[PDB]
Design an enzyme around this catalytic site. Sequence first.
Site, PDB file in Angstrom:
ATOM      1  N   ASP B  18     -29.782  10.352 -26.039  1.00 47.15           N
ATOM      2  CA  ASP B  18     -30.328  11.295 -24.976  1.00 47.15           C
ATOM      3  C   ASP B  18     -30.115  12.292 -24.002  1.00 47.15           C
ATOM      4  O   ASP B  18     -30.773  12.626 -22.290  1.00 47.15           O
ATOM      5  CB  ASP B  18     -31.557  10.108 -24.526  1.00 47.15           C
ATOM      6  CG  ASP B  18     -32.423   9.181 -25.870  1.00 47.15           C
ATOM      7  OD1 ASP B  18     -32.797   9.981 -26.414  1.00 47.15           O
ATOM      8  OD2 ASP B  18     -32.677   7.456 -26.000  1.00 47.15           O
ATOM      9  N   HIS B  46     -35.198  16.638 -32.191  1.00 46.17           N
ATOM     10  CA  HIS B  46     -34.811  17.898 -31.080  1.00 46.17           C
ATOM     11  C   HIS B  46     -36.240  18.939 -31.496  1.00 46.17           C
ATOM     12  O   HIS B  46     -36.604  19.800 -32.091  1.00 46.17           O
ATOM     13  CB  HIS B  46     -33.476  18.518 -31.747  1.00 46.17           C
ATOM     14  CG  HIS B  46     -33.240  19.503 -30.488  1.00 46.17           C
ATOM     15  ND1 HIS B  46     -33.482  19.118 -29.057  1.00 46.17           N
ATOM     16  CD2 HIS B  46     -32.697  21.135 -31.047  1.00 46.17           C
ATOM     17  CE1 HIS B  46     -33.138  20.479 -28.682  1.00 46.17           C
ATOM     18  NE2 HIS B  46     -32.570  21.881 -29.714  1.00 46.17           N
TER      19      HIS B  46
END
Lengths: 432, 432
Positions: B18, B46
Amino acid sequence: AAATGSRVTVVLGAQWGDEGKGKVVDLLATDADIVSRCQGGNNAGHTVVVDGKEYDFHLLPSGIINTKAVSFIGNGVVIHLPGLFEEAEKNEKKGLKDWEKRLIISDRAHLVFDFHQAVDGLQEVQRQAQEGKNIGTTKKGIGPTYSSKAARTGLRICDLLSDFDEFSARFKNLAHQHQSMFPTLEIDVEGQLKRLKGFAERIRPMVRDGVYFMYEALHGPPKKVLVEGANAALLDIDFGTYPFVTSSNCTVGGVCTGLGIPPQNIGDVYGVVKAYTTRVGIGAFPTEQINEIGDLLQNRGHEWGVTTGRKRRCGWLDLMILRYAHMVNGFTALALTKLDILDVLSEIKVGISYKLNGKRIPYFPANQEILQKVEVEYETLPGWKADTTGARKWEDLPPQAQSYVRFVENHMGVAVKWVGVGKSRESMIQLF
Amino acid sequence: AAATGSRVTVVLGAQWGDEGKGKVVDLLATDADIVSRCQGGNNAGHTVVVDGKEYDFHLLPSGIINTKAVSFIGNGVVIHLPGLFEEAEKNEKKGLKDWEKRLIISDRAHLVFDFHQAVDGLQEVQRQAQEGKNIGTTKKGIGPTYSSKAARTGLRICDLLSDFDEFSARFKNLAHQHQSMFPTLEIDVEGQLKRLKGFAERIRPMVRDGVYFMYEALHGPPKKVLVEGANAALLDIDFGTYPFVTSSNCTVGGVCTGLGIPPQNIGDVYGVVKAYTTRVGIGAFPTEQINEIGDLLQNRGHEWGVTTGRKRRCGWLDLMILRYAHMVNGFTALALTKLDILDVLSEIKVGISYKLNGKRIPYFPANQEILQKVEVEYETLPGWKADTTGARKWEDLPPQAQSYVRFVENHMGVAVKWVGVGKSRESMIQLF
């Protein structure tokens, strides 16, 4: 580079194993500061002889003969505590003293527990029987432990060394799950845990942080680090002739993942290649010679199991696999071994390409079905018909032997730095 | 080098994931000839936006937006055929047309079968329940398939594409074994095999020899190849904070093993580092802030699951893990992201060392028990107390922000090439 630090040196098998890469490792371990292993492999053994005494290594790095060097086992290796000490003591009783003083085990290495060897020496059966596909899962429990690693439900040295209750409790949950997947699996937890608690203290003084141990080694003053590759390129979990392969990455990448060092810290990578091709067990074999030639290569080469006696399948050198091994490993130099085995031949055949369904393919087939279907394209070269066992310089090798060598260098694109013509160190001629 | 060929470019997470490495990948995928993945990871997603349209990628490389480039999936990736096409079609219906025309799958990639997801979404239970240690085995069946790979009893694309009878028969033996290890596991072989035979033909035109495909790519005329790293260094099977880790090597080594390319074919390796530390789920967390600061970093950073909503644990930047990530990956440059989140703070704390039992240790602890025991040594720096979201040059960042940057470069030894202060491309300032 001054920032990069020292670049490790690696030795890897380029074919199906048994190329004789131990003679290269042995040759190089002499002036090495650190000798190590980064992946388990088949756990095959290597015999090193020093002063009439003969040592047998399986898990321990072969450079442990050098008492002036440090032997290191990487995180990428699965270890069986009893297996280790049984091997260490055995050699200890052969002349190898103070080994515990120069051996370091990375605390990030996974443990092969007794029940891992059990389920392994249990699946082979249910997996085969009557007439299956006996891949030959070496009953060392290597695969079973590699799956625990995958399931993230396995244990490592660092855990065995930490709080023993949590560990003992984690050992129990693991063995339980196993007994839940294999009902015919007997264990005896308390007995094994007890024996492990014994190993914890016995091995504690040798365990260290592997990653930091290596980072410092190649970032401090210039050191010579040598890495012994597990088996060979075609026995690589990812790139080998799957499924007839090992559970480890036996290629250069495994050096990064088995030691925790970036690609820039990797320097010379030698590919050990036999002057002809051998292989053990079931599976496709493009250049295999089931004839007088094979029998010859098998006899002159002593191509048979060192413990079982099983004969190895023999065939002509194969450039298709050789180049494939290179695309993957990026060899900087090669060690061509057993060239003397061919001293007797009148003309040698070497495979240079593969043709599938009449067409010439440039890649090495990934699946068995296709690989078994390829028809080999050969290049017949003239033999030197002379004894080369006494050669000790490039200039000694007869004109056709030198040609056989250039042939391999040219079609591979990698230079040969060692030509082997015997079993002794002197027999491993250095070309540059 | 002229012999080496082209050196691939890699992007990897430096902490617990992250970090926002997709903004680097997205930034770089623009002028890339080939964009790829080499290891599965957690299969996290993503989101990339182009012309108001929003795409969601999980298995497919994010560079597939570039219709002038080639997207490649490496052998080191485990793939679920339905998962793949379900993801591909979804985006196809969002504007992503002709994707099947620029996607290539390495035939050496292993297949995640429906029953692999089953046993996965079955072990989590028996593994946890009442009050165990819910590592959070992402029910994508990633681990189960990685074990089959280990047992050498699994299947790959190349096998699905070869003789279907042998495959169908090998599929049966595999599912049987699974049902033998998990009795409460329902399957329906014929139904799945039938659906797979459908996938075989649908995926055939995209499969190719991955190793040869790459060797040619970097040995032909100069090409720019980009590789998207799976998750982050501390979620790495071998080097992460085990067992709270992924089943894949998420470090640089996995690029060699996931693509089949030697270390010399690896060039720039960017480490994506967040200006502060986050992490999801159980496990040790040295710099964690369970207070007003954490709440702030969590709010200003929107640190929560994108699908679940679960808040991520937040803490101060931690140089101990940062350096560890480097020893393993050998970063050439970094991308410091979310620095703007800290624009509000009056003074920022950053951990520089770990002290175990009163002593200052130089390594990153491998086991949970030890890691949870470390007391962090901090360095308090003054904040810039100013909005940096508008910065677009190094000279824009206020004096203390620039200091925060040099601080990270110095203590890591790696230069920062990108400083992120927003969500748009322009917000990712390039320092050199």
